[PDB]
């Protein structure tokens, strides 16, 4: 038996897994898949063989992300500056200027007092609290409604939406408002601190972390999927798919929320919980590396197409290059490869797509989903709940994080919590 | 006998008059100088022969003002943009930008923040009751104190403080920052409307509106300058320098405020008021027209100067240009040439000084000072109160305008305010 099971070897269980052991405990981890890092993912690329890509998390901020800086730090990881951006190819209308901010002198008034609105509404939210427990109801709305009470004039109206699309992986209509200031809260109550935050990226990849962090874990087993948490005894009992039980004090679930619901828990989890643990976040993010060629260096493109954000990700060569694109996988096919010319064509008129790459997050099984959002009206019912402890049994991961969530630093966050809490008994 | 004396001959006293006239009462208008307009005062420039001037308001913003609005469309009167700004000439330091805005993108996320406060604070502010009667006491610091609070970088900062000490005609530790948020609410609640409503000037200066609106008024007289004003009688009686007294049931005084420690009332005015109609208060506001060789069209120029503002004001010839200046009286000499050719050179270093024009509103007896503005600590003493009648003694003014001080549109609005307190009798 262990002092702690931590089930799912992404960042969240890394951590836990890593300081539990180094704490004295005897730490098992279970990872369902054959890799490690979970939603970080670098890989080679599926388009230009030798290439290593980010197919999912890939950006930080070291001021707005401090436990992700000290993990750097610690292990001496390489960083650099995201390629800095100086061709401007806005969609945002003929009143747009093409630079980083688009916002016409116009439109400054309008902007200015919705700046307000917005940064008072965001700062209705303590952090620390949970939506669900600060009468925030009125806020947990469909984002277009939300957004429609702001009259904003049209370059800044479609500025803010598109950026909001990208960020939060849903169309205005099935995102939340509430969600919406919930990021703005958790970048020190600061809308544009939400863009800004795409800072740096790992130098040599997520997995440089991965593997730096993997290597003081004594105790891990891959290819083993967790179907069962069983506390119902003196002791945790952990089944499996292909395999003996495992037992432990404790156990740490560091799995993706949209998963739980497959896992049977005895006994059942509190049942404030288990409606929007069935249910699933409505996160719908949908990230595309998109292979091209006739791109200049250096572009960024926000606007009112089907992809609200297209910008550069790396050199390939003299004529060939990577882009990124963010929408979302209700609203876009990220195969229908004609699809993808018309939404790059919108954009960029004179470029070429020779091929894309891209992980279907949500319909990987270990999964389920890529980064969190909650469906309107979600997480003013239950949130906070949703990441804390039921008896010995832990929740962590970004996915749960008041703090940081959808973002590495969040699943680092709720690891030091659950490690803590786990320390004190 | 007169249903009314109305006291002094700017835009306050011209609508008053002119309005309870038409209404059928029986006015007079007494003005102690040779012209009407006060400190609207278009004559011949000092500099240039031919050369029309404004030498004291000027600029309007049709949706900010909307009486003002309605006279000049009463009386058909033209107005024009004011010359648009193309060159940007700015002393804010290596990272400012020379564009309209000059705020750098590194400053961004500050400025964010400080919009926030600075809005929030100017929200607590309710126009209609008063600032002394709004628990407000905590705003009425000096400005460089308050602004300290808000830490912003440097182009930021000195671009804030810069407008408003051209703004409010006081250097930053002797302004008010409690003022400086009712300028702020009054434009809607918005920083930027503040320098935005410098939107358009009267084509052919400001004596035709105060030509027209006089032409509606029967009987005026110039040169009397009024000493006392007794209203211990059944009827009050105005008494005047050079002349015999003139009676009437209800005065109006529509001189400046740091003027009506000059005339003797009967009763003495309510105690609450006496102090500070005693001290005056601080506006130092110094506004010059420079003639100037050299400089292109189109100039602005904010920074850190002596002069905070310099900007064009008017083409004189193909070489030739008037361009003005804000600073303040108290920290300015504008009789010292070698101190304004320092002042613009530091800006404009290529351009040469031929002349300046300006008018001592501080020494003017008429006057003893420009616009209005509050000493720290004064408004939160005493504020509505200056502008409330004592028994039929009205007081107007853009002085004591809560909608509007210091505007024109202010001496509309309280002079509306006096003829309907009075058609009410
Ligand atoms: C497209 C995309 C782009 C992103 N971009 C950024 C970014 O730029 N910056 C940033 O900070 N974040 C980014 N993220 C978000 C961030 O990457 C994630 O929220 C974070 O990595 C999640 O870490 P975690 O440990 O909570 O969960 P995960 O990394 O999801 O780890 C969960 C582990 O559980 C395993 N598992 C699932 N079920 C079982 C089971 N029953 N038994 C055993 N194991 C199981 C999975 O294999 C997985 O390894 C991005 C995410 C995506 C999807
Ligand atoms: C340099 C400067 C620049 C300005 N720029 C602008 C601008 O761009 N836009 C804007 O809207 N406003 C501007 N103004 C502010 C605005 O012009 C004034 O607040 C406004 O015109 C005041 O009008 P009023 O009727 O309250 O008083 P005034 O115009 O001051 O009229 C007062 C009248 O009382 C007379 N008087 C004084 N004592 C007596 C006495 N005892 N008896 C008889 N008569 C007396 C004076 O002669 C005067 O005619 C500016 C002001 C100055 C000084
Ligand atoms: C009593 C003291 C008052 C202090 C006043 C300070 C503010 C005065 C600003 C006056 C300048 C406004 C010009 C508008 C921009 C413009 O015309 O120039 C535009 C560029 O302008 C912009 O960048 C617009 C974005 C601004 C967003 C508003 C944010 C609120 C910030 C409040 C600022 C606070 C200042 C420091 C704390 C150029 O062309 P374009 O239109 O094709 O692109
Ligand atoms: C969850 C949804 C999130 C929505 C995010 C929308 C905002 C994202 C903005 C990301 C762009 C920031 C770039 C900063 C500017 C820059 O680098 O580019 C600068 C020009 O930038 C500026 O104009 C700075 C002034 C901005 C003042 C801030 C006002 C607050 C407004 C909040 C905006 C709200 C948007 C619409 C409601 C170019 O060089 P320079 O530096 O030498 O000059
Ligand atoms: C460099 N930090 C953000 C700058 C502003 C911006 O618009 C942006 C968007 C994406 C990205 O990768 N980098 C920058
Ligand atoms: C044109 N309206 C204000 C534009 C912005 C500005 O900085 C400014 C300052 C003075 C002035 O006369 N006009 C404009
Ligand atoms: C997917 N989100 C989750 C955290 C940050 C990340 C992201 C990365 C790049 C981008 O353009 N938008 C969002
Ligand atoms: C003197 N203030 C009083 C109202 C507006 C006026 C003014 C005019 C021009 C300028 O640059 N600053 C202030």
Redesign the interface.
Known sequence: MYDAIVVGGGFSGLKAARDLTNAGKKVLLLEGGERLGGRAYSRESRNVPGLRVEIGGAYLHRKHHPRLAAELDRYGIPTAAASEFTSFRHRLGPTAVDQ??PIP?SE??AV??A??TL??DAHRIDLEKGLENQDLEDLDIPLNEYVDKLDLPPVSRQFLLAWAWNMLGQPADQASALWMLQLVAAHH?????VV?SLDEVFSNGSADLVDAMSQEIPEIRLQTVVTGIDQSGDVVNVTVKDGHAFQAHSVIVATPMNTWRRIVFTPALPERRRSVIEEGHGGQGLKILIHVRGAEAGIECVGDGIFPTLYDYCEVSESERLLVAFTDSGSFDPTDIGAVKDAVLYYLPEVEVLGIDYHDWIADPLFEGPWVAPRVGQFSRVHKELGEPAGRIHFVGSDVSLEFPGYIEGALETAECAVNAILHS
């Open positions: 980083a901010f002198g400054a008034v200015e007092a700046t307000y940064l008072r109550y600061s809308i544009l601190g800004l």
